[PDB]
Amino acid sequence: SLVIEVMEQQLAKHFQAILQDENRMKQIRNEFRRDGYFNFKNFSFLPKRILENVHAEVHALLDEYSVRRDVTVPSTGNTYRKMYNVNQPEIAEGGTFIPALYQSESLRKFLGNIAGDDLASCWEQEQYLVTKLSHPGDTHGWHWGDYPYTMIWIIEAPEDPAIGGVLQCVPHSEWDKQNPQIWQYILNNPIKSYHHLKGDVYFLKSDTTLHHVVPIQQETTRIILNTCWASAHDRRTDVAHESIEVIWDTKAR
Ligand SMILES: O=C(O)CCC(=O)C(=O)O
Numbered sequence: 726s727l728v729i730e731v732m733e734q735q736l737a738k739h740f741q742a743i744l745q746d747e748n749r750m751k752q753i754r755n756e757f758r759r760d761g762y763f764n765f766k767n768f769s770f771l772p773k774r775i776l777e778n779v780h781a782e783v784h785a786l787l788d789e790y791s792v793r794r795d796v797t798v799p800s801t802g803n804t805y806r807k808m809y810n811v812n813q814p815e816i817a818e819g820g821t822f823i824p825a826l827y828q829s830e831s832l833r834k835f836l837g838n839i840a841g842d843d844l845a846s847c848w849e850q851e852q853y854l855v856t857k858l859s860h861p862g863d864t865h866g867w868h869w870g871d872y873p874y875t876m877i878w879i880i881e882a883p884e885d886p887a888i889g890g891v892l893q894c895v896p897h898s899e900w901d902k903q904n905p906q907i908w909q910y911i912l913n914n915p916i917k918s919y920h921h922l923k924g925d926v927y928f929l930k931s932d933t934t935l936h937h938v939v940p941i942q943q944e945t946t947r948i949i950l951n952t953c954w955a956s957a958h959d960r961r962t963d964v965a966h967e968s969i970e971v972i973w974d975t976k977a978r
């Protein structure tokens with residue numbers, strides 16, 4: 726309670742210091758909207774101490790709740806999901822910093838400032854998820870998100886991109902679960918590829934940016950936290966969660 730109250734104060738001061746440079750914010754909003762992506766590199770998104778607390782929490786959650794999954798997702802053209810993961814109810818049961826950060830007003834206002842929108846909590850069992858890629862073949866195939874505003878926290882990552890785990894993106898698409906047309910979006914757009922290191926945290930426009938994680942080529946450790954927010958002006962009533970159900974499940978396993 727008191728640690729979280731102090732943490733929110735440190736977050737507000739951190740985000741206010743970034744927002745003070747409006748001319749730089751214009752470029753950040755530009756890049757995020759144009760590319761559907763913006764990376765806060767080298768422990769810059771949060772105060773470094775708080776970020777390292779998140780890294781330790783993710784490691785502890787994997788040590789406690791890790792579940793191996795090797796499935797295909799019919800709503801994303803049957804692309805593969807081969808990973809260890811921890812779902813939202815498991816993170817909600819043992820986590821402390823991650824559930825609090827998801828509800829952080831200063832964090833939501835800062836991301837909303839970049840995105841040009843108001844952030845709100847998404848469907849509960851998708852609010853935060855963890856994935857771990859380790860073995861050759863582990864991947865997070867081509868997909869979209871059901872909700873627009875996703876933050877990916879790089880907990881562990883190989884420094885050599887040849888080992889795998891590269892993120893590739895096609896922005897300004899959208900998700901047709903019955904007719905995804907993934908290859909047509911790839912043919913009609915250039916693909917931008919990104920490599921990430923431990924401490925990176927990147928903002929992703931997940932509902933209109935087709936993306937995937939290049940499969941692992943050699944035994945390594947790639948761990949990410951996914952915090953996902955809806956739009957406060959989302960007027961959708963019939964959002965299906967078939968991808969979350971098959972990869973992470975909705976109950977503590
Ligand atoms: O591992 C990444 O960098 C992205 C993972 C992802 O796309 C997701 O969690 O929805």
Ligand SMILES: NCCC[C@H](N)C(=O)O
Binds near residue numbers: 801851854951968
């Ligand atoms: N926030 C999690 C997004 C998962 C995505 N719909 C997928 O099929 O992997």
Ligand SMILES: [Cl-]
Binds near residue numbers: 868931
């Ligand atoms: Cl996504």
Ligand code: NI
Binds near residue numbers: 868870931936
């Ligand atoms: Ni994704």
